[PDB]
From a paper:
CNNM/CorB proteins are a broadly conserved family of integral membrane proteins with close to 90,000 protein sequences known. Structurally, CNNM/CorB proteins are defined by a conserved core consisting of a transmembrane domain (TMD) and a cytosolic cystathionine-β-synthase (CBS)-pair domain. Here, we determine the crystal structure of an archaeal CorB ortholog in two distinct conformations (apo and Mg2+-ATP-bound).
MtCorB with a C-terminal CorC domain deletion (MtCorBΔC) purified in DDM yielded crystals in presence of Mg2+-ATP. However, upon structural elucidation, the unit cell only contained the soluble CBS-pair domain. The isolated MtCorBCBS structure from the in situ cleavage of MtCorBΔC allowed us to visualize the detailed interactions of Mg2+-ATP binding at higher resolution. As observed in the structure with the TMD, two molecules of Mg2+-ATP are bound to the central cavity of the CBS-pair dimer. The adenine bases are sandwiched between Phe233 and Ile311 in a hydrophobic pocket comprising Met298, Phe237, Ile236, Val212, and Val213. The ATP ribose forms hydrogen bonds with the side chains of Thr207, Asp316, and Thr313. The phosphate groups are stabilized with Arg235 and Ser234 with the bound Mg2+ coordinated in an octahedral arrangement with three phosphates and three water molecules. Initial phases were determined by molecular replacement using MtCNNMCBS structure solved earlier, which represented 40% of the crystallized construct (residues 199–322).
Residue numbers in the entry:
A (entry chain A), B (entry chain A): 199 to 259, 261 to 322
């Protein structure tokens, strides 16, 4: 009966980027941290508007273009803190997505849960 | 009691690259196929010597250097076809690795199993 909040990486520890940032800044963030996916926020940290994959950023430099983070980002899968991870694991598998964004009772950013977070429970 | 061979992507369907290839060729392979990890073989397809992550290839162009695939590739986790996926899932989690290389009774390349292959069993 484990829930998302029990395995999530909390907001305070999440590497993020603003949708106004450049792709060069995003590449620097990806390189320094090593993560493959970083949430994208608009104005406020609690306003998650997308996720940014390092792949899409590297492939866009294809060729140098007018690509903005808002164009390369994709919609996240938002879930409540009470979501049971046995359901989340199957749901992420159907979507072929690695990361879900956890929201609190106010609909604000609480943290993230990846498949690796859920599998960490099983040793 | 499901085994690796029952969920693996067979050799015939695996995108690979030779350790003599250039990093530019590897980037082209990653872009056309979309995969994040491709096995590396030496001389013969059945002689898997490493795995190549698109991240390490993109980060090496850091700066243009004398990087060879043999330098950027890492050791794979080899398993038999009879390996039970319940054990493999936990083993990959401990290693933080996404892909395992399946070998046949002759120790030759049979296929690959990723976490997504094992999770596909659960819907
Ligand atoms: N942007 C991020 N900020 C903070 N923690 C993150 C971030 N992305 C992933 N994590 C955490 O890192 C740990 C490993 O997650 P995961 O393996 O899915 O990410 P990754 O190593 O970036 O990706 P991958 O293995 O698919 O290349 C988990 O705890 C996950 O919560
Ligand atoms: N190099 C490859 N050649 C053929 N099939 C592959 C290859 N890499 C992965 N697959 C298959 O693709 C499917 C999805 O695997 P997986 O999600 O681990 O890979 P990916 O999409 O390349 O990586 P990721 O989601 O970590 O960026 C699985 O069937 C896996 O067997
Ligand atoms: Mg995938
Ligand atoms: Mg709370
Ligand atoms: Mg990881
Ligand atoms: Mg056989």
């Amino acid at each position: 009966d484990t829930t998302a909040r029990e395995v999530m990486t909390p907001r305070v520890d999440v590497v993020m980027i603003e949708d106004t940032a450049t792709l060069e800044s995003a590449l620097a963030i990806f390189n320094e941290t090593g993560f493959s996916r970083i949430p994208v926020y608009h104005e406020r940290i609690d306003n998650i508007v997308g996720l940014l994959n390092v792949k899409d950023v590297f492939s866009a430099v294809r060729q140098q273009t007018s690509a903005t983070i808002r164009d390369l980002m994709y919609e996240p899968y938002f879930i409540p803190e009470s979501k049971k991870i046995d359901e989340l694991l199957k749901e992420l598998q159907v979507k072929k997505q690695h990361m879900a964004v956890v929201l609190d009772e106010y609909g604000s950013f609480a943290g993230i849960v990846t498949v690796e977070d859920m599998l960490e429970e099983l040793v």
